[PDB]
Write a protein that binds this ligand. Structure first.
Ligand SMILES: Nc1ncnc2c1ncn2[C@@H]1O[C@H](COP(=O)(O)OP(=O)(O)O)[C@@H](O)[C@H]1O
Ligand SMILES: [Ca+2]
Ligand SMILES: [Ca+2]
Lengths: 20, 364
């Protein structure tokens, strides 16, 4: 679909970030 | 291939690597210029402050908007070369900007990155929008209170609605200042910049927001339950009472600072009211607190109570105050720049060389 819609969807999914 | 994330705040610059949970560097947004001109050409952050007595100290982002680009280039140069120990020509750079940033300023950020720092790619994101992304939302309203500025930002699917953005020139700096003024009643004399730093620490450790100010004032007048001790660097111990909730009360009652502004609660409501009725349910149900000044214990409940008094009776209000909200702008940037789906969003040098700085408008 739209590149912006895929971005929005991945932001809603969330992600783990590397602990520093 | 690490992207860099730079959050240029009115008070503190936060910098690090995309994919990381926290910035590698946090330093004051100050540039120091020698008064005598006779040894380094400029100093940035902690070093500028440690030599304050021989430098002309500059605050180029005092209220969230850059007022001096040379000072800004110096902050960026210090971020890359001294703080992160990176060559900016080797990394995509994600920069943050204040909401309602003038179109000319977005162009200067873009030009400086490609022309002065030779970045292979860059992107400019609104701070408040990054805070919403940090909480896993794409629609919502952000109350971002930092050091020199507070903004209320309604967001619909990643787009900050500019007609609905409101700004208050009231934040942490004003609260610290107010606290020094009110602490004189206890015979305390905080005047020097080093003493201003002690008071900022008292604010950050012992201040809170009262659920009902009038009631809280009665409690402190009737008992000693709210009195707290604080040990100064010298070793001397001081007591703080109603000043604990009187200083943050200025966010809700700007008249305490001698300001005619509406409080943070009414500003949030005014922003919601500037938006289409169809998305208001989504705004009230997603109120995201961001920035150091929203860190106060009790602030979320106070916002819930205040907003409930202004909102339609049938409206479900939800306040989201993550415990890491002091760095949520940075965290959102780290998430954004390390996402696979974001990789095609970057403004490349090739695109910039073809279009000039104006490309930021079409891309960011
Ligand atoms: N725990 C805390 N409680 C209250 N205020 C805080 C706390 N931590 C930081 N602050 C205040 O927040 C401000 C810095 O917040 P920040 O969002 O980083 O600002 P900016 O982006 O404008 O530089 C300062 O005025 C600081 O004293
Ligand atoms: Ca900020
Ligand atoms: Ca007022």
């Amino acid at each position: 679909p739209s590149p912006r819609e895929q971005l929005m969807e991945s932001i809603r999914k969330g992600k783990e970030l590397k602990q520093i | 291939v690490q992207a860099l994330v730079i959050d240029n705040g009115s008070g503190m610059c936060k910098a690090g690597f995309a994919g990381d949970d926290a910035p590698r560097a946090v330093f004051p947004s100050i540039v120091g210029r020698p008064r005598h001109t006779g040894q380094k050409d400029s100093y940035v952050g902690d070093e500028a402050q440690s030599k304050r007595g021989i430098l002309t100290l500059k605050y180029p982002i005092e209220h969230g908007i850059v007022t001096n680009w040379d000072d800004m280039e110096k902050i960026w140069h210090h971020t890359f070369y001294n703080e992160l120990r990176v060559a900016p020509e080797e990394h995509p750079v994600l920069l943050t900007e204040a909401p309602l940033n003038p179109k000319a300023n977005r162009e200067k950020m873009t030009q400086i990155m490609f022309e002065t720092f030779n970045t292979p790619a860059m992107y400019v994101a609104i701070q408040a929008v990054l805070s919403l992304y940090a909480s896993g939302r794409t629609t919502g309203i952000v109350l971002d209170s930092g050091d020199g500025v507070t903004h209320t930002v309604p967001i619909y699917e990643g787009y900050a609605l500019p007609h609905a953005i409101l700004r208050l020139d009231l934040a942490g700096r004003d609260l610290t200042d107010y606290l020094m003024k009110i602490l004189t009643e206890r015979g305390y004399s905080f005047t020097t910049t080093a003493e201003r730093e002690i008071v900022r620490d008292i604010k950050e450790k012992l201040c809170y927001v009262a659920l009902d100010f009038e009631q809280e004032m009665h409690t402190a007048a009737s008992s000693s339950a709210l009195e707290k001790s604080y040990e100064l660097p010298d070793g001397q111990v001081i007591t703080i009472g109603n000043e604990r909730f009187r200083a943050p009360e200025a966010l809700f009652q700007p008249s305490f600072l001698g300001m005619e502004s509406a409080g943070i609660h009414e500003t949030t409501y005014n922003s919601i009211m500037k938006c289409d009725v169809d998305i208001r349910k989504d705004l009230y149900g997603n109120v995201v607190l961001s920035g150091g000044t929203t860190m106060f214990p009790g602030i979320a409940d106070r916002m819930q109570k205040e907003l409930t008094a202004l909102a339609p009776s049938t409206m479900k209000i939800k306040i989201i105050a993550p415990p890491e909200r002091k760095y949520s702008v940075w965290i959102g940037g780290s998430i954004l720049a390390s996402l696979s789906t974001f990789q095609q969003m970057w403004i490349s040098k090739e695109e910039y060389d073809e279009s000039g700085p104006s490309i930021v408008h079409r891309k960011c």
